[PDB]
C-alpha cells in the first residue's frame, strides 16, 4: 500500500538560558529512523533504525551539516516572528514544521506537505496543489508574500516530486525487512467490577505493525462506538504498537459482547469475548 516520509521539526527559544533547542525527527511510515537533537553533547544526525546502517559516512556528514544549518536559520526565524507579532524578547516561543511526501504502492507521489505552526497554532502551509500557500494570520501573510517572490513553492515542489520521493523509495528498499513487515495483533480481554452490578470489559490488541488498526465492541451484531472508551494507538518501545477499547456492560450479561480486531496482519479479524 502507500508509504510516507515525515520530518517533525521543532525550534524552541529559551531566553537567558542560551540558544534555541532544535530538533529533527524523521519517520518512514510509523517508524522513527533518524534524529538530530542540538542539546546533545556532540549534535550529530544519527540513525534510529538498524536498517539505516546501509548509509555511508557521507550521508551522515551531509545531514548533520544540513541540520546545523537549520538550527542556525531557525534561530533567525524566531527573532523574525517576535517582530511580526511585536512580542517581548524574553519569552519562550515555538516553531513547528511537518515536512514530507507520500507515495503509493507503485512508488509515485500521492501527496506532498510542508506545514508550519507558531506557538502551537497554524502559521502557514503549502496547499495540496504544491503551488500556493495558505496563511493562518497576518504574520504568516508576510512570509507568504516573500516565498511567492522567491518561488519557494516551486523549490518545495521540486523537492517533493524529486528528492523526497526518491529517498523514500530508497529507504523502503533498504529497510524492507522492517518497513514492509506485518506483525499480527495479539488480543485478549480483561474484566473489571464497577459499582451497581456493572462491569468494564477491556479489549487489548498487542504487538502489531503497522500502527493502523480498528477495535470495535459489539452486542447482537451492532457496534457500540458510542459508549466505547479507548486510547489513541501507541508505541510499545520495540517498534510495535498497542491499543485498547472498553465498554461498560451489565453484570452477568458479559457473554453477549464480543471484541473485533481488524488489522492488515489478520487475514480474518479476531473476535473475542470474556
Amino acid at each position: 500500500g502507500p508509504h510516507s516520509l515525515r520530518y517533525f521539526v521543532t525550534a524552541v527559544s529559551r531566553p537567558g538560558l542560551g540558544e534555541p533547542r532544535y530538533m529533527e525527527v524523521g519517520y518512514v511510515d510509523d517508524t522513527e529512523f533518524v534524529r538530530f537533537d542540538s542539546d546533545a553533547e556532540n549534535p550529530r544526525y544519527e540513525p534510529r533504525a538498524r536498517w539505516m546502517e546501509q548509509e555511508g559516512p557521507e550521508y551522515w556528514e551531509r545531514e548533520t551539516q544540513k541540520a546545523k544549518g537549520n538550527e542556525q536559520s531557525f534561530r533567525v526565524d524566531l527573532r523574525t516572528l517576535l517582530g511580526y507579532y511585536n512580542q517581548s524578547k524574553g519569552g519562550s516561543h515555538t516553531i513547528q514544521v511537518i515536512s514530507g511526501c507520500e507515495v503509493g504502492s507503485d512508488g509515485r507521489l500521492l501527496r506532498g506537505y510542508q506545514q508550519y505552526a507558531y506557538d502551537g497554532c497554524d502559521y502557514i502551509a503549502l496547499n495540496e496543489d504544491l503551488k500556493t500557500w495558505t496563511a493562518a494570520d497576518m504574520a504568516a501573510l508576510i512570509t507568504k508574500h516573500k516565498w511567492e517572490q522567491a518561488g519557494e513553492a516551486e523549490r518545495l515542489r521540486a523537492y517533493l516530486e524529486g528528492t523526497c520521493v526518491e529517498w523514500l523509495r530508497r529507504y523502503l528498499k533498504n529497510g524492507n525487512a522492517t518497513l514492509l513487515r506485518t506483525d499480527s495483533p495479539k488480543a485478549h480481554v480483561t474484566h473489571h467490577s464497577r459499582p451497581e452490578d456493572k462491569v468494564t470489559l477491556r479489549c487489548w490488541a498487542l504487538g502489531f505493525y503497522p500502527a493502523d488498526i480498528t477495535l470495535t465492541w459489539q452486542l447482537n451484531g451492532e457496534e457500540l462506538i458510542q459508549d466505547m472508551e479507548l486510547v489513541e494507538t501507541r508505541p510499545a518501545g520495540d517498534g510495535t504498537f498497542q491499543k485498547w477499547a472498553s465498554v461498560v456492560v451489565p453484570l452477568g450479561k458479559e457473554q453477549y459482547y464480543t471484541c473485533h480486531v481488524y488489522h492488515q496482519g489478520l487475514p480474518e479479524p479476531l473476535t473475542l469475548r470474556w
Binding site: 520530518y7 521539526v9 529533527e24 524523521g26 550521508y59 551531509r62 545531514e63 544540513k66 541540520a67 544549518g69 537549520n70 536559520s73 531557525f74 533567525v76 526565524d77 523574525t80 516572528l81 516553531i95 514544521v97 515536512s99 510542508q114 508550519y116 502559521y123 502557514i124 512570509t143 516573500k146 516565498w147 522567491a150 519557494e152 523549490r155 518545495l156 523537492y159 528528492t163 523526497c164 529517498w167
Partner: peptide
C-alpha cells in the same frame, strides 16, 4: 533527507 528550510 529533509529539505533545507526557507526563512519566514
Amino acid at each position: 533527507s529533509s529539505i533545507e528550510f526557507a526563512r519566514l
